[PDB]
Design an enzyme around this catalytic site. Structure first.
Site, PDB file in Angstrom:
ATOM      1  N   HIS A 233     -15.267 -20.144 -34.623  1.00  0.00           N
ATOM      2  CA  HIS A 233     -14.904 -20.686 -35.888  1.00  0.00           C
ATOM      3  C   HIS A 233     -14.489 -20.065 -37.132  1.00  0.00           C
ATOM      4  O   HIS A 233     -14.011 -20.630 -38.057  1.00  0.00           O
ATOM      5  CB  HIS A 233     -15.908 -22.025 -36.223  1.00  0.00           C
ATOM      6  CG  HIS A 233     -16.934 -21.605 -36.514  1.00  0.00           C
ATOM      7  ND1 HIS A 233     -18.437 -21.687 -36.049  1.00  0.00           N
ATOM      8  CD2 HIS A 233     -17.326 -20.686 -37.691  1.00  0.00           C
ATOM      9  CE1 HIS A 233     -19.325 -21.147 -36.894  1.00  0.00           C
ATOM     10  NE2 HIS A 233     -18.721 -20.789 -37.889  1.00  0.00           N
TER      11      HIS A 233
ATOM     12  N   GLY B 146     -22.226 -18.860 -44.515  1.00  0.00           N
ATOM     13  CA  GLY B 146     -22.110 -17.472 -44.272  1.00  0.00           C
ATOM     14  C   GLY B 146     -22.984 -16.639 -43.291  1.00  0.00           C
ATOM     15  O   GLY B 146     -22.572 -15.507 -42.998  1.00  0.00           O
TER      16      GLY B 146
ATOM     17  N   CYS C 163     -23.294 -17.432 -40.196  1.00  0.00           N
ATOM     18  CA  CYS C 163     -22.721 -17.479 -39.114  1.00  0.00           C
ATOM     19  C   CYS C 163     -22.575 -16.304 -38.452  1.00  0.00           C
ATOM     20  O   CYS C 163     -22.074 -15.449 -39.111  1.00  0.00           O
ATOM     21  CB  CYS C 163     -21.512 -18.335 -38.912  1.00  0.00           C
ATOM     22  SG  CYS C 163     -21.959 -20.056 -39.266  1.00  0.00           S
TER      23      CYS C 163
HETATM   24  C1  LIG Z   1     -21.233 -20.024 -40.959  1.00  0.00           C
HETATM   25  N1  LIG Z   1     -21.290 -18.705 -41.551  1.00  0.00           N
HETATM   26  C2  LIG Z   1     -20.611 -21.112 -41.583  1.00  0.00           C
HETATM   27  N2  LIG Z   1     -20.432 -21.062 -42.922  1.00  0.00           N
HETATM   28  C3  LIG Z   1     -19.891 -22.310 -43.412  1.00  0.00           C
HETATM   29  O1  LIG Z   1     -19.434 -22.360 -44.628  1.00  0.00           O
HETATM   30  C4  LIG Z   1     -19.459 -21.313 -45.527  1.00  0.00           C
HETATM   31  C5  LIG Z   1     -19.775 -23.461 -42.857  1.00  0.00           C
HETATM   32  C6  LIG Z   1     -19.874 -23.254 -41.415  1.00  0.00           C
HETATM   33  O2  LIG Z   1     -19.596 -24.487 -40.518  1.00  0.00           O
HETATM   34  C7  LIG Z   1     -19.905 -24.219 -39.224  1.00  0.00           C
HETATM   35  N3  LIG Z   1     -20.480 -22.374 -40.788  1.00  0.00           N
END
Ligand SMILES: *C(=N)c1nc(OC)cc(OC)n1
Ligand SMILES: *C(=N)c1nc(OC)cc(OC)n1
EC number: 3.4.19.12
Lengths: 304, 304
Positions: free
Chosen positions: B41, B143, B145
């Protein structure tokens, strides 16, 4: 979202852990620059520990009696000195992994991470707080002495604790990195009882703000209180008195949530008087006090 | 003595964390050998996330669109591929800090450490478990993820989790390092509700053994039960059924304490039926289920 009891990343401190052996005693040392810091009780036998005269015991020790091993390799000891309850072993090699560092003496209520070690090798990392009675509730087995507590500010490690002792009640005592014990504890195997372990009120309030930020809001009520009224209840429940300095420290969390500090005090007052009624806050059935307001802001903002 | 929610030392994993940016999205990557693993993603805009066709979105991406930064330096991407829900970015440089490692897919009830990261930089380390409904209760902000979960066996890091998602209920979902989600979750911003979060019975029993080993014994009673009688109570309280495999796994803790597994089941049965009555076990007012029997043995023995 979500709120966890989080420790600082331990890598910077793992690079400083060494094994120190004196005679038949092996514990951990902290290697920073060309100095290895360790508890002075490394020179004691189990018998010596009952009534040790450290200055006298130390006279029988030379540089070559302090065996310092960093990983698989031996460090050469070129000097040794005693500073309060720690020994400083000067070695001929600066630790190439020495991070930016400071030695700080923390106040009760402050939290820090502990890197539990055995034989100079890291076993685990956990978060804890300096209790108001100057003990810490750690997880330390025999051989864990010399494991350290620390905080990190971006790339600078502030070392605040070195493990020395377990009291007969299972709580722990230790020193700052200048060798001064926290509280009235001594490095002697004698009757040492801890005082009242009061709850760190400012930390409970910070954690209630973290609960509101992360969606747990059931405990919010329609009331307010004053510092003096709150403190009457805090005294009854063995909570530390809340000061205007604590209120000021909670200012940013109050601003973020729109909940006035005294309103959160009133929520806490009701939780103390009514209990949880089988409910939980951030996965806990008790009021958590080992997150400072700074920890809550740090975790809720993602400081690296 | 003392028993803490302890995470593995994070240094080996800190050496693998990198920043991955695709367009306007920045998250974390895991750099092992010459491959950087990250959630697929990373290629999605906030709009794409509602109904993404990853294969189609990926066609518009080239190696030069994946910006990988390790510390202050940029890594050159020489290939990219999608494996399930992760991207594998082949870089021209092997990570010099690559530890010995394995990719493992854990079962529900298993615990692991998470090194929460932002912009490829570690922020904290905490311990958690794969819930029976295949969610984890983490602490992850936007952030985070690509932050990973792992276990360590002396010097080999077994990576078991990569963070991808937060469900609307504040619980987290992610994949193993082959990109397969735990449970039925998908990397799409859609209605994804978790199933029942049952309590990991075998882990509660292990933690009760840790409590006995560390001196908290008030909950020990004069009773015993059978697996079938215990499981009738476990079902009533949304506890996972205890099997003979779980009893076998608790064998060493039973041997260490001299408390038969079924006797501890009877203690747990009474705690479920009677509650804690305002008492605590190892500093907790609820029955803790995020310590496996292996974690209890490891912490109680000091494995490094
Ligand atoms: C993962 N870092 C992450 N960050 C998001 O917004 C900054 C949204 C998201 O959605 C899956 N995942
Ligand atoms: C610290 N490592 C330690 N270890 C002991 O025995 C192995 C005893 C002790 O007493 C202070 N400290």
């Amino acid at each position: 979202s979500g709120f966890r009891k989080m420790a600082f990343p331990s890598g910077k401190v793992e690079g400083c852990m060494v094994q120190v052996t004196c005679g038949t005693t092996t514990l951990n040392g902290l290697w920073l620059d060309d100095v290895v810091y360790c508890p002075r009780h490394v020179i004691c036998t189990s018998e010596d520990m009952l009534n040790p005269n450290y200055e006298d015991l130390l006279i029988r020790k030379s540089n070559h009696n302090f065996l310092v091993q960093a990983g698989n390799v031996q460090l050469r000891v070129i000097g040794h000195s005693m500073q309060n309850c720690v020994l400083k072993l000067k070695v001929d090699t600066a630790n190439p992994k020495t991070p930016k560092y400071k030695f700080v003496r923390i106040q009760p209520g402050q939290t820090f991470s502990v890197l539990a070690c055995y034989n100079g090798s890291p076993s685990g990392v956990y978060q804890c707080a300096m209790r108001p009675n100057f003990t810490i509730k750690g997880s330390f087995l025999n051989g864990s002495c010399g494991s350290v507590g620390f905080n990190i500010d971006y790339d600078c490690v502030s070392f605040c604790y070195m493990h020395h002792m377990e009291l007969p009640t299972g709580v722990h005592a230790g020193t700052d990195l200048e060798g001064n014990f926290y509280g009235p504890f001594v490095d002697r195997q004698t009757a040492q009882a801890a005082g009242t372990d009061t709850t760190i009120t400012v930390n409970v309030l910070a954690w209630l703000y973290a609960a509101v930020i992360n969606g747990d809001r059931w405990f919010l009520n329609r009331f307010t209180t004053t510092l003096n009224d709150f403190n009457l209840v805090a005294m009854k429940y063995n909570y530390e008195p809340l000061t205007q300095d604590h209120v000021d420290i909670l200012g940013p969390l109050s601003a973020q949530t729109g909940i006035a500090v005294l309103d959160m005090c009133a929520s806490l007052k009701e939780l103390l008087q009514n209990g949880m009624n089988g409910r939980t806050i951030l996965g806990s059935a008790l009021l958590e006090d080992e997150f400072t307001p700074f920890d809550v802001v740090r975790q809720c903002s993602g400081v690296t």
